[PDB]
Amino acid sequence: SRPQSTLRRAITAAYRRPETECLPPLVEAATQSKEIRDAAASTARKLIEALRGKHSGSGSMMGEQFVTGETIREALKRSKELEEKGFSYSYDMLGEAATTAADAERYYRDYESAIHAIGKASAGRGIYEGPGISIKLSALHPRYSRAQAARVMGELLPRVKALALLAKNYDIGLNIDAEEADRLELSLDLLEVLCLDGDLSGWNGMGFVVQAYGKRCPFVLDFIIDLARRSGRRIMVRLVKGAYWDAEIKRAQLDGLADFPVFTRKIHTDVSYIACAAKLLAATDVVFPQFATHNAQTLAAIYHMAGKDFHVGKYEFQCLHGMGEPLYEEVVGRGKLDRPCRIYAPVGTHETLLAYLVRRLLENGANSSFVHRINDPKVSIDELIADPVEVVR
Amino acid sequence: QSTLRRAITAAYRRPETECLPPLVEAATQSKEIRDAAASTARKLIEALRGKHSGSGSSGSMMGEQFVTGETIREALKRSKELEEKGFSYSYDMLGEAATTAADAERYYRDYESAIHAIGKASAGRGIYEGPGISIKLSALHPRYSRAQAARVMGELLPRVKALALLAKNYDIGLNIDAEEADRLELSLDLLEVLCLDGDLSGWNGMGFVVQAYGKRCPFVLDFIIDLARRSGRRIMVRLVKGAYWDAEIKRAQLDGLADFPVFTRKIHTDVSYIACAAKLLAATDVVFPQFATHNAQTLAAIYHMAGKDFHVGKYEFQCLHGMGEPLYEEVVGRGKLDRPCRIYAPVGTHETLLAYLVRRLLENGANSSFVHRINDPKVSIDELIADPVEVVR
Ligand SMILES: Cc1cc2nc3c(=O)[nH]c(=O)nc-3n(C[C@H](O)[C@H](O)[C@H](O)COP(=O)(O)OP(=O)(O)OC[C@H]3O[C@@H](n4cnc5c(N)ncnc54)[C@H](O)[C@@H]3O)c2cc1C
Ligand SMILES: Cc1cc2nc3c(=O)[nH]c(=O)nc-3n(C[C@H](O)[C@H](O)[C@H](O)COP(=O)(O)OP(=O)(O)OC[C@H]3O[C@@H](n4cnc5c(N)ncnc54)[C@H](O)[C@@H]3O)c2cc1C
Ligand SMILES: N#CCSCC(=O)O
Ligand SMILES: N#CCSCC(=O)O
């Protein structure tokens, strides 16, 4: 059969599978024992009570708090304080959706210079304890969303390979951010080619994001875990819910779709995230799970799902600069939960901030978001710590 | 179809360089007016920079700064303080881009109930001294942008007419907000039908927004001014720059068009606004101009262009709730410029607030926006009072 025919066919089959058909296997995989659910509820209650206690009871629209620096040099200087406490960083040179070849070339050079600076700052700390970088493929090919995959692939692959080689040379992480649903397939084919490229051998810093609001998420994870097994690379896998929900809904409506590529009920994304976390936690020999979330209930659920055995390098949590520090200050550190957290740290100016800021406003301003609900007087602590899997079981 | 309508259609995507010369000419003011406006603008900006207005005051992503109240009853109670200072209100029941019949029906009921509450609160103060309402056509039809314009107008017409008749019953203003460029034509056709409908005779509260960032703006104004003169309806015309610029640019780039329906240089929109303001000020016999802006240079130019004769009902300024009060506190009242300002006042829950908030983020966060520059230490007062015609190059 075609290489990985079964795994690839499962991804394609899920693309726009009816939401009601996607959920039952996820609900079963996300169901935890009463004993774990009770312990997770107690942990989540503590995290929320601490969140407010140290921040005047609270759980800017201009978003200066979302950018760590205007240049990589400035961002690296401002990272020392939180690294001393046990946080790590992943730097994001802001910029995406290149419209011209010159723009894509400028973004490439920004990433290249950033890797040199981050690699020097890492100073041999390696991919888990030291800083890394995150990149967006849409920054590196003009009209990434429009051109045929063969053209986008043949030009993008040498650029990403060159960046990955530099990250290998400094032994830092290099993560491919996940963007719109229609570019998942291309990005995953690129990940495969890089993981099978012998020039990158011996480096486990290649990382890839999977969005749990997507119907393909568990099948993409199956493909990635199998790719790790056959390539010999321990792939870093950032599990997120997803940043483009409002845009995906609008696009699917304009595409005339009867079934969308993302879930439309928020708790279905929560169930998908927990089910996918269970899959990742059973594969830590071959992937490095990175649980990106600001939701204290999700965090507590995974913390207890992962069990008592932990070492740095097994898995980590992640958060966004300007959103997650108050929560993760109750997580990192021996007297807290003793689990590491990597801060995603945007670097740039107003000329590159708006697209990211809009996604942050849609995240922070939505009534369904944990970060909004924690400040909503109508939402009880009972509701914040409730397991969403029990709502749909 | 008419000569005036043909001028609108022909300008839809006219090359930007061809649009500018007639706007530059019409926006050119005499030396005496330019000097007086520079003095007034400097005074306003010096007062603004003693305050803490602009983008830095936009508050948190909860959006609290931008919403007047959760319900119309709450919003009406909170309007008394500013109404006695010389402000009026236009209430906006939040909600737009209905995707289902149920949603469009709910938005209709919200508008209808707001008209009854606003009309009772107006208590015979009339369309200039008393409060009004603003509506979005996309809230009232479930496929406003995705169905044939002819059919959309025909189903929308009875709903808008019913709301207009209620507004006539109480003698309040009812404004149709302007949305995306591809719906200008439909909304203008609806305005014409309403202004020729004898059931609405004797009421001057019908209002309509025109966006100066659009290439069709001056020609839309010529059509509306002629419609007012021939119909005997003193149409309230809200002149704005426009709220959807980023979306219009992205849509136009995707559609592969060489010439967009909006200007692409901010200074061109500023020139267009002043040119269109000159056209409206020459037509105050037949239309009621409403100059919506937070830009102190734009305001000062219009104040001087309008001349010394003023009476309530000649024209007014307008601002957005949570953005315009610092500037307009230097305008309303007998100790200031003694000109009225109507506050656009959103009403609704946090859920319905989100889409409006995104447009406020794009407005407040853009380095080119007056409200951002007023706080920017790199921007001089000299630059803020520059006359757009003298700067365009
Ligand atoms: C370090 C880090 C890196 C990230 N990288 C990426 C990336 O590369 N690509 C990407 O797309 N996202 C990425 N994200 C995720 C995104 O930016 C948001 O931070 C995340 O989705 C919020 O989830 P939460 O668990 O913190 O919050 P929660 O409030 O628990 O969940 C909110 C999420 O639920 C989803 N949602 C909301 N409404 C609905 C609905 N009606 N139906 C279904 N789902 C719904 C959306 O995904 C929304 O963001 C990243 C997040 C972090 C912290
Ligand atoms: C009471 C009120 C009601 C309004 N109603 C509507 C409505 O119904 N529909 C609507 O679309 N808008 C409406 N607006 C306008 C919109 O929401 C913004 O408030 C307004 O455009 C900001 O203009 P300004 O003169 O305050 O600021 P300025 O800073 O002087 O101007 C900013 C504006 O310039 C334009 N612009 C920015 N960059 C560029 C560029 N590169 N090229 C071209 N133009 C550019 C945009 O229109 C932007 O908003 C309304 C505004 C007010 C105050
Ligand atoms: N969050 C995150 C990293 S990728 C999506 C975005 O940039 O918002
Ligand atoms: N400003 C304004 C009223 S209409 C456009 C929007 O709602 O942003």
B160: tokens are 């808008």
Give the number of other CB atoms < 10 A from CB of residue B2: 10
On whether the CB atoms of residues A70 and A348 are closer than 8 A, the answer is yes
Pairing of strands A174-176, A132-135: parallel
Resolution of the structure in the document, Å = 1.4
Is A320 touching ligand 3 by the criterion CB < 6 Å? yes
Q: What is the DSSP letter of A130?
A: S
Q: What is the DSSP letter of B221?
A: H
**What CA–CA distance (Å, rounded) separates B274 from B268?**
10
Report CA Rg, chain B.
Answer: 20
Q: What is the DSSP letter of A87?
A: E
H helix intervals, chain B? 3-11, 16-27, 31-50, 72-77, 80-85, 101-122, 126-129, 149-170, 184-195, 217-231, 245-254, 266-281, 296-305, 325-328, 350-365, 370-373, 381-384, 388-391
Closest CA to B310 of B332, B330, B327: B332
Is B356 touching ligand 4 by the criterion CB < 6 Å? yes
Q: What is the DSSP letter of A262?
A: B
Q: Is A291 helix (H, G, I), strand (E, B) or coil?
A: strand
Residue to mutate (ligand 2; options B240, B260, B344, B374; most atoms within 8 A of CB): B240
Determine, for residues A365 and B55 on separate chains, whether the beta-carbon distance falls below 8 Å: no
On whether the CB atoms of residues B211 and B226 are closer than 8 A, the answer is no
**What CA–CA distance (Å, rounded) separates B240 from B245?**
12
Q: Where are the beta strands (DSSP E) in B278-340?
A: 287-292, 316-320
**What CA–CA distance (Å, rounded) separates B133 from B109?**
14
Give the closest residue (by CA) to ligand 2 atom 47. B242
How many angstroms separate the Cα of A336 from the Cα of each of A52, A82, A331, B18, B212?
A: 16, 15, 5, 66, 56
Using beta carbons and an 8 Å cutoff, which residues of A are at the interface with B? 60-63, 99, 146, 253-254, 350-351, 353-354, 357-358, 360-362, 364-367, 372, 375-376
Q: Which atom of ligand 4 is nearest to the CA of B92?
A: 3
Which residue in B61, B350, B366 is closest to A361 by CB distance? B61
Which domains can be identified in chain B, with CATH numbers?
3-390 (3.20.20.220)
Ligand in nearest proximity to the CA of A323: 1
Buried b (16+ CB within 10 A) or exposed e, B162-179: ebbbbbbebbbbbbbbbb
Residue B329 has φ and ψ, to the nearest 5°, of -65, -15
Q: How many residues does chain A have?
A: 393
**What CA–CA distance (Å, rounded) separates B177 from B157?**
15
Q: Is A207 helix (H, G, I), strand (E, B) or coil?
A: strand
| Residues of chain A positioned with their CB less than 8 A from the CB of B353 | 365
